[PDB]
Each structure stands twice: as C-alpha cells, then as structure tokens.
Amino acid sequence: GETLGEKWKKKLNQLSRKEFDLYKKSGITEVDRTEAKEGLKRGETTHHAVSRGSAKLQWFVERNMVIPEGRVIDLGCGRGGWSYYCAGLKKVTEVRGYTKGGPGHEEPVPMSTYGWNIVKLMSGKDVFYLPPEKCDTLLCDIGESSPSPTVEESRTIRVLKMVEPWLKNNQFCIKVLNPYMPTVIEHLERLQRKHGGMLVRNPLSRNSTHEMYWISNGTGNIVSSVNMVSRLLLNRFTMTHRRPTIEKDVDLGAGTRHVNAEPETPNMDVIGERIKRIKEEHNSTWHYDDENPYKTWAYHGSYEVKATGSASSMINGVVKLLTKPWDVVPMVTQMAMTDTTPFGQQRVFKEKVDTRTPRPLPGTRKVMEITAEWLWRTLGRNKRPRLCTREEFTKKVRTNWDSAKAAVEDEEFWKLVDRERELHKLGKCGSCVYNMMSRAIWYMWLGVRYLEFEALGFLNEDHWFSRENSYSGVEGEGLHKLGYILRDISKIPGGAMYADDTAGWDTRITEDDLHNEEKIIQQMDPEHRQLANAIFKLTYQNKVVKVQRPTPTGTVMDIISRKDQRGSGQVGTYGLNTFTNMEAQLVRQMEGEGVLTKADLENPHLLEKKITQWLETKGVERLKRMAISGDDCVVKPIDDRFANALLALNDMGKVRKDIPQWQPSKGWHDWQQVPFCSHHFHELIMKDGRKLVVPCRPQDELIGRARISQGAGWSLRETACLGKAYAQMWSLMYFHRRDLRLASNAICSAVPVHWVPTSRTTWSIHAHHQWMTTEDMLTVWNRVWIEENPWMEDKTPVTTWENVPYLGKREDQWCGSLIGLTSRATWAQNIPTAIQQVRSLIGNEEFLDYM
Amino acid sequence: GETLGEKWKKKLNQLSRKEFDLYKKSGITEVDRTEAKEGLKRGETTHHAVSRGSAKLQWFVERNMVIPEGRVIDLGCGRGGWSYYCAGLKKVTEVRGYTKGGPGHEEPVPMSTYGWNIVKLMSGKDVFYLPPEKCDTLLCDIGESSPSPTVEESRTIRVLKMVEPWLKNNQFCIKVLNPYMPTVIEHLERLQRKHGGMLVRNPLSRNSTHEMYWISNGTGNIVSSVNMVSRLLLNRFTMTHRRPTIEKDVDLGAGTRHVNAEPETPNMDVIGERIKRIKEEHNSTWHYDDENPYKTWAYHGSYEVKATGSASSMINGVVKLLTKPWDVVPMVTQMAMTDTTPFGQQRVFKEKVDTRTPRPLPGTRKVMEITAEWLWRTLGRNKRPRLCTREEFTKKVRTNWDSAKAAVEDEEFWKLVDRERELHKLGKCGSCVYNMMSRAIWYMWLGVRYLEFEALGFLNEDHWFSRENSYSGVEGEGLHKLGYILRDISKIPGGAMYADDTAGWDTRITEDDLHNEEKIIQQMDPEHRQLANAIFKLTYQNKVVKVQRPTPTGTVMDIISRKDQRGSGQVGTYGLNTFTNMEAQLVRQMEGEGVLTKADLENPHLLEKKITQWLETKGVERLKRMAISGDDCVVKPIDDRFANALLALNDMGKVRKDIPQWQPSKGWHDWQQVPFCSHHFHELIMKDGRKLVVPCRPQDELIGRARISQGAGWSLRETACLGKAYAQMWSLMYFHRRDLRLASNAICSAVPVHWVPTSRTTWSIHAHHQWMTTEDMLTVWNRVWIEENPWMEDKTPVTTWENVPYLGKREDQWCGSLIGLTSRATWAQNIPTAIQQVRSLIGNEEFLDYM
Numbered sequence A, B: 001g002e003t004l005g006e007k008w009k010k011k012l013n014q015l016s017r018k019e020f021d022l023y024k025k026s027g028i029t030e031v032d033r034t035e036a037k038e039g040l041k042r043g044e045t046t047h048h049a050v051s052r053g054s055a056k057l058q059w060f061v062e063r064n065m066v067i068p069e070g071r072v073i074d075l076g077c078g079r080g081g082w083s084y085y086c087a088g089l090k091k092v093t094e095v096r097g098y099t100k101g102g103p104g105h106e107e108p109v110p111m112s113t114y115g116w117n118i119v120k121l122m123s124g125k126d127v128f129y130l131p132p133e134k135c136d137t138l139l140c141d142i143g144e145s146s147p148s149p150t151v152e153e154s155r156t157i158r159v160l161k162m163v164e165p166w167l168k169n170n171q172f173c174i175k176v177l178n179p180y181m182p183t184v185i186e187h188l189e190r191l192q193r194k195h196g197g198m199l200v201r202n203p204l205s206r207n208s209t210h211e212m213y214w215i216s217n218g219t220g221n222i223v224s225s226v227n228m229v230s231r232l233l234l235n236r237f238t239m240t241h242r243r244p245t246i247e248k249d250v251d252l253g254a255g256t257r258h259v260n261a262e263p264e265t266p267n268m269d270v271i272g273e274r275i276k277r278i279k280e281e282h283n284s285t286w287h288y289d290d291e292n293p294y295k296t297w298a299y300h301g302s303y304e305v306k307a308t309g310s311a312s313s314m315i316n317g318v319v320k321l322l323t324k325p326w327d328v329v330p331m332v333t334q335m336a337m338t339d340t341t342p343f344g345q346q347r348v349f350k351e352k353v354d355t356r357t358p359r360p361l362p363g364t365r366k367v368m369e370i371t372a373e374w375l376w377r378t379l380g381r382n383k384r385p386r387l388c389t390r391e392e393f394t395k396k397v398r399t400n401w402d403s404a405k406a407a408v409e410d411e412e413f414w415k416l417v418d419r420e421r422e423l424h425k426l427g428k429c430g431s432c433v434y435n436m437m438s439r440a441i442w443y444m445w446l447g448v449r450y451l452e453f454e455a456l457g458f459l460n461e462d463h464w465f466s467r468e469n470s471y472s473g474v475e476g477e478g479l480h481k482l483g484y485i486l487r488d489i490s491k492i493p494g495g496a497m498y499a500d501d502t503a504g505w506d507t508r509i510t511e512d513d514l515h516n517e518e519k520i521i522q523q524m525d526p527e528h529r530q531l532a533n534a535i536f537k538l539t540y541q542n543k544v545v546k547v548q549r550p551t552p553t554g555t556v557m558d559i560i561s562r563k564d565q566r567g568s569g570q571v572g573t574y575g576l577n578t579f580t581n582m583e584a585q586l587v588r589q590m591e592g593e594g595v596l597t598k599a600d601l602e603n604p605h606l607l608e609k610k611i612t613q614w615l616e617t618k619g620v621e622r623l624k625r626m627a628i629s630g631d632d633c634v635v636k637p638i639d640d641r642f643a644n645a646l647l648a649l650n651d652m653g654k655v656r657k658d659i660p661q662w663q664p665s666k667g668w669h670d671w672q673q674v675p676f677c678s679h680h681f682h683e684l685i686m687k688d689g690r691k692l693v694v695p696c697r698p699q700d701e702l703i704g705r706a707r708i709s710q711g712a713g714w715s716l717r718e719t720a721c722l723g724k725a726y727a728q729m730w731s732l733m734y735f736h737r738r739d740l741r742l743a744s745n746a747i748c749s750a751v752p753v754h755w756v757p758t759s760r761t762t763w764s765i766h767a768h769h770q771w772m773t774t775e776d777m778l779t780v781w782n783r784v785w786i787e788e789n790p791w792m793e794d795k796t797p798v799t800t801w802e803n804v805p806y807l808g809k810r811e812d813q814w815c816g817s818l819i820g821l822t823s824r825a826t827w828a829q830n831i832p833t834a835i836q837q838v839r840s841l842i843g844n845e846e847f848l849d850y851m
C-alpha cells in the first residue's frame, strides 16, 4: 500500500539536476526578491522583507487561516520573516522569535520595519530544548528535507510532538515537512481532534517539497487534502513547463509602533446617517466582521459582493506586434503585472493606507497656519471663488463614462442631487461615499462628485494654480512647457534644484492640513460658503469608504471611515495637494534660511511677526523658485542649507521617500536631470539652429504602457485606434527618441489613415491630447513647438521631419534606447513585414505606409 | 629685460607631456584625498573636505597669514573648500560663497560638516558682475592658467581690479595667478601701499603654476619673494625628481555650530594659582595672545619655547632589511607618516579636541545617576578603596623614564610632593598641570602623577576592573585570553554581538560623567576622601593644560583650561573610562529592552523605581553580556532591538564613529569577526586535536609598527634588541601568521642569541610582555598557551613548532598575508642572504640561525 506521496518522492529522486531545477518551480507562485536582496546588500533596515518567508506567511494571513494576535511566538524564526510581518498586524502586541543560529543555520537580521519595537528575536535557542510558554499565537516553520521519506517522517513527528504542548485555545501555523507518510497522517489526525485546524498547501511552496501547514482556523479531511497535493505534484512532472507566477514582494514599512495610538475614533453624528443608508440598501447581507484587519480606520460593517479585478492587465496586440524586441525586456512586461484583485487591494491598503501620522508640534502648526492664510490671500488677489453648475458639470461629461453621459441626461439624477444638497445646507450628509477600487448607488456616487465639483471645482476650472496666478503652479501649462519652466528656474541664482518625493502624499495629509486648506471659504459668498463648508466638514474631514476584502467565504465590501488623509478619489485633490505642498515647501525654505528654528517648532506660543515679515517681503520671490504640481515639487533655494533642513518637513508629516528620515537631500544643478511629473527634460538644438526643450523618460516605460489595452473586451478596431493614439503622442512629445519615432511611423502605417484615435493615452493633468486628430502630424508639431510656443521667437515653420531633432545618440541609449543592439537592427529591417501582418489582421482599409 | 618667471614659463611650455607630469609634482606638498573622494562618491556629508582647497587655505590660516573672522565672503567658492573650512574657525560668524557654476565650472557641494548652518553658497554668481559688499574677511581664489603669460597677465589684473573695492581694514587672502609679469608687479606694489599685506607661495601649489597669494597679515618685498619662487621653480626643472610630501587631509567634523555656546567659563578660584606659578616661572616671555584659536577651551596666556616634534617617525633598520617586500606596500610605510610637529598638534586639537558636548537631558542624567551609584556599590562589594604610597610608586618606576628613576630617588622631589599635598588638603592646587605633547617643571609634573596615583591608583593596582570583580571588565586578562572571553560571550543566547566605536571618547566625557565617577569617594576613609576629592574637583573637573602653537615668530606654549572632558594623560583614565562605558552600555541595554523610553529621557523628574528594579534583578546578568576595556566595548543584548536604541547613547554624548547619528548599528554573530582592543580572534585546531583562540589583526599594521625605532639616536644594538622583541612577540601571539613566524625566525637568527630584548613593543594594558626573555620561545609558548591557559584542559606540552598551527591559508591571505605573491616567494628564498646582511652590520657575536 504505497501512497501517492511516496510515488512522487520516488520520481523526484530519480530526476537529473537540470530537470529537477525546471520541475521545482513549474507553475508555482514566486515572489520577486531582486529589489529586497539589493536593499539588504546595502544594509537598508526599512521596508524590505528579510526573506521570502514574509510573503509566505502573508498568503495564510490573507485568507484568515491564521490571525496572529496578542503574544506571538515564532519557533525557528531564522532571519525573522514571519516575525517582522506579524509586528504590523492589528491585534499583535508582542513578537518573540526563537532560532538556533550558529554554523549552517540562519541568523536573525535586525530591521527597522514597522513594529520593530515589539519584536524580540533570540538566536542560540534550540526549540527542542525549550519549555513551552503561554502565548496567543504559535508559529513554527521547522522541517529539514531528506531524500529519505522515513528520515523526514521522524523529523516531522519530532516537530509535532515538540510543538503540541505550546497549543491550547490559541492561533497557530505549523509547517508539516512530510505530511504523506501514514504515521504522520495518523498523528495529525489525532492532533486535529484535540486542537482542531486543517492542513493547507501554500502555492509559494516549490514542487520539490510536499510541505503543508497545519493552521488553526479551518476544518477538513487531512487525508483528502494531502493526496490532492500529491496528485497535483505528480501531474506537474509530465505537465509542460510553465514559468512561475511572479508577484510583488511585501512592504513592511518603517518606524516604532504604538498600538494604543492606532485606533480611530469616528464622529458618529456626522457619518452615522451614511452608514445607515448603506446598511438599509444592502440589508440582506449586512454583517459585522470582528476579524476585519483595519488598525487606523474605523470599521462599521460589511455586505457580501461579487469579486472584482484581474491579476494582470490586458495587452494591446497592434503595438506589441510592431515592437517585437521588447517582448524580451523585463520592465516593459513587468508593467502589465498589476493587481486589482481583492487580495492586492488589501495588501496596498495595509502597507500604504492603514497608517497614522503623528500630530505636528504646536510651533509647526502655527507656521502652517500663518503661511496658509497668507497663501490663500495671494491666490485670491485677482480671482474670487465661485459655484460651478449642473450645466457646467454636464458639459464636461459630454466632452469626454457613457453611463455618466446617460446619468447627467436623466432628470431623476438631478432630483437626487437636489435632495442631498438640501441636507448639506442643514449640516447633514446622507449618501456621500467614495470607493477604493442598483443604479441608485451609481447615481449616489456620481451625484457626490457633482456636489464636490459644485463647491470646489472653481480651483480647477478657473485655473487657481496656473503659473500666473500661483507663481509656483504649472496648471494648464502642458508637458511641452514644463521643461522650459524648469530651465527658467535654473537661471535663478542660489542652491541646487531639489525634487524630493513624499512617501504616499495623500496619506500624509493631516487634520491641520485639512483645516488650513479649509480657509479658502472665508473668501466665498455666504451661499457658496455653506455648501463648501459642508464638503470640507462632512465629506473631507469625515470620509466614509467602501473597500473590498477577500474572506474564506467570498468577497465582502467593508464600510470604513477616517478623519484625516486625502480622499484620493475626489474633486479638488490636485488643487489642495498643490496648495499644501506650496505651503510646505515655503516652510522648509524658512528653515533652510534660519528663519525657523527647532526652538520655534517646539515653542507652544510662536511669535508671528518674524514669519509674517519673511512672507510679506520674500514670499512671492520664494514661490517663483518652485514648480509644484500636486505632490510633485521642484525647489531652488537661495543656498544649499535647504538640503539639511529636515525638521519642519518631517514634523509636518511629509516624510521623504526612499531615504533615511534625517539624511540630507541631494539635488541637481543640471536642470535636465531633474525629475518632474514623471519626466526629465532635454534641451535640443534643431539643425535650423533654434532650440527645443523636450520631455523624456525611460523608454521601456513608454513602450510597456503603450502595450496595454483599455476595455475588458478588445474589438481590434478599438484597440488599434488606441495604438494610433500612442503613435501620435510619441511623434508629438517623444519625436526625439529614435525607437519611438520609428515605431510611431510603423503604427500609423499599419492603421487606416481615416480612423480617428480613441480612448485616452493618459489621464495626466499635463496632457492636452493634441495628438488625438486626423490632421497631419507635422502640421500639429509645428503649431505646438513653433507657433504657440512662447520660448520660440523665430516662428519659421519646419517643412521636413528631418529638421526635427533626435536626442544625442549616447543620451538616447542612456534613457533606454535599444539602438546599437543586433535585435533592434533586425527589428528595423523587419518593419514593413510587421506592417503587413497588422494590416492583414485589420483587413481592407486605406493605408499610407510610413518610414 | 626678460624676467625669471618668463624664463620658467618658456621652459614649461617646451616640456613633453610625460616630463610635464613628473615636474609638476616634484618636491611639492600634496594632501591625500583617497579617503575623501570615496566618501564623497558614496554621498557622505560629514568630515570630508569637499576639495583639496580646504587644506590649501589651512596652510595660510595655520600661520596667521589670514585669520578669517566676522562675515567671510568667498569669491569663486567653487565646490566650497575654503568656505566649509572657515565655518569652524573661532571668530567666523557667517560664510557667504559666490561662484559661477554652469558648464565647465565647479558647483557648490552641500555638506553637513561643522558650521554648515552659517555657510551660504550661491551658484550662478559671476563675481565680475557683482557690487562689492561689506565684510570682515575677503577670500578669492580665481585665476585661469594659459600657455600665454600676457593672457594670464590681463586675467590677473582683472581679478585684482575686481577685488580691490571689496577690501578696507579687513582680512583677505587673494590668489594672484601670474605674479611675475612686470605690470602685475607694478599693480601689486601700488595695491600693497593702500591695503598692506604681502605675497606668499603655498607649498601645496604645483610647480606647473607660478601662483602666489596676496594675504593681509604680513609685510615684505613683493619683487623679492616673486623671484625667490621663480628661482625655486627653475631649480626644480633640473633637480632630480622627488616624490611629493604626503600629508593627511583635513577633518571638518559635523553638526550645527552655535557660536555663543562655544566659549568656556573658567573657575578662576580653582585654577588661578596654577596659572600664576607658570607665569612666574616663565615671566621673561609671558604674554597674552589675542589671536589664539581656542573656541571651547579658556585661554590664559603664553610663553615662548623651542620647537618639538618630527614630520615622520624613525625607522628600525634591522627589521626593514628582513622584510623587503613590504617597502612597496602603502599602509605599512603610511604608518610612519606621523606628525607631532606644532602644526600637526594644532590640527588634531582643532579637529578632535576643540569641541563641546551638549548637556544631556534631565531624565538621562537621572538614569546615569542611578546606574552609577549601583555600579560603584557592586564594584566595592568585596574591595575597599585604598591609598597608594611613595614606596609603591617608586617600585613601579624602578621596574620599567630614566629621569623618573632619578627623580623618585631624590628626596627633594618628595619634599615638593609633600608641599603640594598639603595644599590639596586645604582645597588648593598650585602646580598640577598636564600637557598635550627647569627640572622644577619636570618635578612638578612627575609629582602630580604621583598625587593622582596616590588617590586613584587603587583602581589599577587592585584590579577593580578585572572580570571577577566587574563582570564586564578584562583588566589583567591579557591579549591571549580576550578571544576566549568573546567566545564565552557568544554562547549567551540573544542578539548579535555589537562593538560600536565612540568618536573621540575622552572628549565626550561630560560634567555629569565626571560627577558620577566621583561617587567612589563615598566608600573611602576620611583622609583618603579628602585627597581624592582634591584630585576630582581641582585637577579633573578643572584642567590646566600646556599645548604648543606655531606662530609667525616661532613656537609658543599656550596655557588653556577645560572643565569637562577626560584628561587623557592621567592616572585612572582607563578605569574611569571603563566605569563610564559600563554604565553607558547598561543604559543602552535598558533602552533596547524598552525599560527606558524617549519620554523618560525628557521627563525632568524620572521615577527611579523602574530603573532600580531592572538593575537589582538583571544588572549583573547584563554586565556579563559585555566585554569592556576603556572606550572599547563588546555587547551581546537579549535581542537586536539594541541596534535601533540610539536615543540615550547620543544624548549622553557618546556618539558613534563613522556612521550617521541615527542609523542603526550593525553587529556580528560570528564572534571571530568582532573587533576588540585593535584585534579580532580566530579559533584554531591544533593537529593534536585541541583548540586555540588566537589574536589577529591586519598584518601590515604589525609589519609597519615593527619597522619603527624608539629613541632619537638609534645605536644599532639598541634598535636590534627592539627588533628581537617584536620577533619574540610575533612568535608568542601571531605564530599563526605565516609571514610573521618566518620573519620572527629570521630576526632571531640575525640577532645575537644572548642579547636581551629591550624597550617596549607596545604600551597596551593587555600586553604582559612574556616575550621579553632569553628563554626558549617554545617553552614560553607552552607555558602561555597550554600550562596556565584555563581554556586548555589537556595539559600535554608541545615538543615541536610544527604542531603549532597556522591560520587557514585563505584566512591568512584575507588578513593581509602576502603568501601567494611572487615577491613573497622570492623574499622567502632570499632569507639566509638577508640574515647574513644584518649579521654583517651588527658584527661578530654568537648567532643561532633559524628557519
């Protein structure tokens, strides 16, 4: 009576080493450790998982198979992957890791990831020599493989007997090295009757091991699940080899965790009615899940729902067939790797959104207060706030979602909007909810963006953050002007040009930020003020949110709430981000100039005379040293003390990304190397003698994004018109890139000339979409780059594309160009063949073939 | 009438490129930038000079040629070398740098070196377009060379005319590109009559440029000094090529400078009498120099003196001739590069000693207080403090300076000692002074170390910091036991082993440290207490110091004073350092364990119940996790939270070396890689089967130090007995190093067998000097490593050196062994030849030649 597991073991040991290497990863899920391993190689202590074990445990935790809580004990913690992961979980209060260490054994790696202060990893600790301790969660990942099943068998029994006394009425997750040996099966069955639980297989396990995990939250037949794994693994012997499914690795954050500072206290007076209506609308599946993971967001309930998302995006075929040598390159195809599944959403939420910012110091709040009041006055020197209207909102919708064009057309939609507006006037809010992913819910949602648009839309529609009105702003300028603005800034004497990224800007917006942004209502007419005051107080400073969550029993929709942070899916996000960033960068300039000291930040009663004088005499000039677009900023300070000015910036919550909190910033003096709005900008001399300033970025980012379809049902003609749109865009904005202009030419010749580009190449505020036309590209290029280009005085047109410059050939290569490679040369010769292939797929329309 | 400068220029332009490269550095002084350039390459912002310009300016500043003060303006600041250097000078309050920048021009580099907060470097600033500003110091280093002298001429005149209006009654240092053209000479002469000053040549200038500097503090004949430079440079054309004189680069420290927190306020009641006596003793040259450089030490006066020191140490010839292939290696000969000249002393003082530590927080002082009181009680549990005596002090002197053996023999010395002791009993101090480098001054000095020895010598003499008495200490253990103690520590379960170096420990000793170390007097007998109280209060907490300083008019001896810091040239330095370090590492362990929080450090009234309980229940066990020898420490905490525990350590002033202040520490789990007392320790298996634990270090450090003579008058027989001493030491402690045992064999065969080793191989407290004997080395080796080695149970002797193990051959190589190189092989064959050479120099004594 030989078991299937033993059959598998017999086949595995007979494998040559090469077939073994191919088999062990065939069709498995594998996390991408490339970034983390290089981070650890440089001694980084934040964000990185210390091993592949963090992701492995995460797979269990995601599915509520084990929910770490209270005192967590991690037997055989090794480098500490499981321990560091548990440190950030809601109900975990202490993590104790024991591991052997010494020669041939992994050692604990010290880290500063989130919750490090409740992690206690001890080496020199053989767990088979340890008396069991009281704990609320028991973890164990011990088990050393052997070519002999019976050797593994005794190792597995040893583990099980060691670990059994640690368990009683607590959570656990225990590795079972060899689960298919009859004596192990028999032992596990008796264990299951005392402590409950079930055996589960982790998809991240390699096929070279039959390992399964005894977890506490589940029931089921041990014998059955084991043989299901055995068959799965035997099947994968003969099954045609398939590459592993690559997932993104975990981000464990940074800093000390204070469990009691995490929970949210909601304003139930304000958000209560909204919950009640969601509850009424979904009463048939409404429930309260105590096992919700939310630490810093208040939880209010859930209802059941059909799942939504995809493990990776759709591919545009027309452009992928015209860019054959980019199938091979990593970062291109590793941009289609996207997860909007309920699992990926929860991962992003935990790692990025489920955080809390400490309140800024009293002196810091004073400075922000003074600066905000000054900034709003400056911004409203010429303009006044105004209400937007139904007709306005309707026009904008029509000129671009098709369900939205139907909704604004329905009078019943506007009756709902009116009803909710009357609530707002009374200080009440009934259906104002946003999401993180009947038609009554669709109407409730679109109706809410309208009421926001009505109250705060003036910031966008009336260009409050144009350069002329805000000095620092770049709204309405366009990607083809941004480079020129940075070049102009570089001419101002002083320090280097700095461009520090904030780590998750929207989550870093504080209660004090929100109350400073609110001050613009003091410039409003009374009836406008009451509507805006409703938006700020009821929906901005008290957000009610829908988010999907995977459960053992299907997907659910959680209703949660938060007082601070920025609702990212909202009208006014860009303008308010730009305003707060302007303010923040002014404050940092004050610090670098010595106007604002450490003593001032801590001083509970800061004197305002000093700040007011600096603003009234230097404020505007310092605004002109900056280019600010939402969370993205470029600052050129009067000197480089700015680099070391980190006190105010951190205390305001605007912690920089990918750099230690107190390490000085590093800038540029060549403006052409400064990153801004996902681009850098090159100065090019036309052979006509004149000069252009062009936007540029890593080419693979441009290639890969173009290879992504829109619409969950590509209809060839639709997906080709999108390919033409990227081609037109490339010829208008990235004409200087040799590979792109050649591929732009190829797409436009492989697509019918009369077909109009559809969909959107991008949703960037800086994109004016001049490329979505039937008009000749050289005539469009002339209009953009010569005619209405204010930094081009000689208005002489260009008659030939050969007077339109490329980048320097080394610079082209440096930014990702494949020019030089053999494959690129081959690809170039093969172009009219690939043209014919696309044209054959489309069919029989009018083509004009292009160089 | 062609000038000599023009003659030089004519010869320089006719040089081929290779002869040009040889000439331009022939016999010049050149700073070593290797460390700094790699530091900057990794983006380090502390300590490093940003260019070779910092050292260049330093040469001028050293000699009072220009003394930067008040507002300093740096024209053509470039990367900012001059500006960052000035930022740390006593009377400088603000540094403004202007430089052009842009293509082809140097750009300002942001740094966090000491005084960065008063440095304002602006780029995009052409100084020939700038209106002159008011300043107290004008710096300018502009001047672009040309093969044409007349091109340079107009460039130099342009500079001089630009810079002249910046000057009036202020300090300046101005580069004169081409000083030898007649029109420049004529212009400089008229400039000198209005603004004074003189032309000076910087030795760090290359021979490829005739550049000189117009400095404000000096007079002299311009024509003369210029032609003296011209002749010097012509001479260097034909002069046989000489390698540049390599100096150590500058260290500009780190952190913000607060000018008003720097000055020292002396206790004149206490130190007044001491100054008065130095003043009386040296009245004929006593003066008060207002141009003294001291920022954080109080200055009291100066007297004139003959210079003392040497630009590099003496070389031992016997061992250098037996180690021929190490003439070539850098770090060996770059260990003889030593500067005890008055110039080097001042550099070390400014960079390392002339600093100030901020007062620790009130909560931090409470913890240190509690821990110190507990530590002293533990240390005195078995022993009592006791007075040491004349007879004791005399015995110690005799058993090792020859002037000291004469002094303790003279009854008149002890009459002076008695006289001073009676002052101490009354709370007065008359002649208690130490130094930084008649016989009445020699007697005053030796008499002072006695009174210290008398009061605090018990700490050393009675082994208060032996491991048995202090748990953490290693006093009296020896370098051959240290490795075994670290191995024993590694067996204690918990975190990694940490060994963080403090940056200049002795300068980091605070007023609170001194007052905690003082508490041991509470365990003394009354008559002992009054003597010790005198030492602590009068000479430890109020130090009067002699230090040499170079001036335009010769060397002087400055009298300065300081309240805190540790007098490094003092009895009890090691014991008090060990005590304070033990205390500090206990405090850091409390923080890592969460017993001590940020709130506690800041809490002005910390509750002691928590600290006292941790000490009384865990104190000793935590002491046993450590090995502490003075400022050097090894800690193995209960887990690795210790790595991130930096709050208390920094606030106590014990800032770590070569690592950002708030970056987590990184440790070891292999105890054999842990650095301790300038060594690491390897475990070796004898072929007898038993194991040894041996001390090891980079071999070039052992080679180079052995190649250094003692005594400023090597008498061959004296310097050879020193070579034998290093040979004996190597065979006892570094027998495992293949190159060293072979070179040990060679020295002992090239030196007469009956000659006894003299002088000292080292002054380390861990050196028991068992190697200074005539006795057979294998018998000495047996006694040390088998007989009285407590970690060697099998006491079976070793009869042959071939049962004495070497390191693993890869490990030998890794630690600097030249085994494998061709030169090492050649060196090995050439040994009996080199033996014969040494023996030929010595003469005709009895040799025994050795393998």
Ligand SMILES: Nc1ncnc2c1ncn2[C@@H]1O[C@H](CSCC[C@H](N)C(=O)O)[C@@H](O)[C@H]1O
Pocket: A050, A051, A052, A053, A054, A075, A076, A077, A078, A079, A080, A081, A082, A083, A098, A099, A100, A101, A104, A105, A106, A107, A125, A126, A127, A128, A141, A142, A143
């Ligand atoms: N007897 C024993 N006592 C304690 N630890 C042991 C042990 N036998 C093996 N181990 C350790 O258990 C570890 C299993 S690998 C565990 C990795 C960990 N879960 C992570 O995510 O990082 C190995 O590093 C091994 O050193």
Ligand SMILES: Nc1ncnc2c1ncn2[C@@H]1O[C@H](CSCC[C@H](N)C(=O)O)[C@@H](O)[C@H]1O
Pocket: B050, B051, B052, B053, B054, B075, B076, B077, B078, B079, B080, B081, B082, B083, B098, B099, B100, B101, B104, B105, B106, B107, B125, B126, B127, B128, B141, B142, B143
């Ligand atoms: N016209 C001008 N205006 C301002 N700076 C100029 C200038 N012409 C040259 N310079 C700058 O002057 C510098 C001289 S090298 C100065 C180095 C500096 N003393 C240090 O220690 O680091 C060059 O970097 C050059 O860029």
Ligand SMILES: [Zn+2]
Pocket: A420, A423, A424, A428, A429, A430, A431, A432
């Ligand atoms: Zn509402």
Ligand SMILES: [Zn+2]
Pocket: A680, A682, A696, A697, A811, A815
């Ligand atoms: Zn580019």
Ligand SMILES: [Zn+2]
Pocket: B420, B423, B424, B428, B429, B430, B431, B432
């Ligand atoms: Zn005295």
Ligand SMILES: [Zn+2]
Pocket: B680, B682, B696, B697, B811, B815
């Ligand atoms: Zn070694």
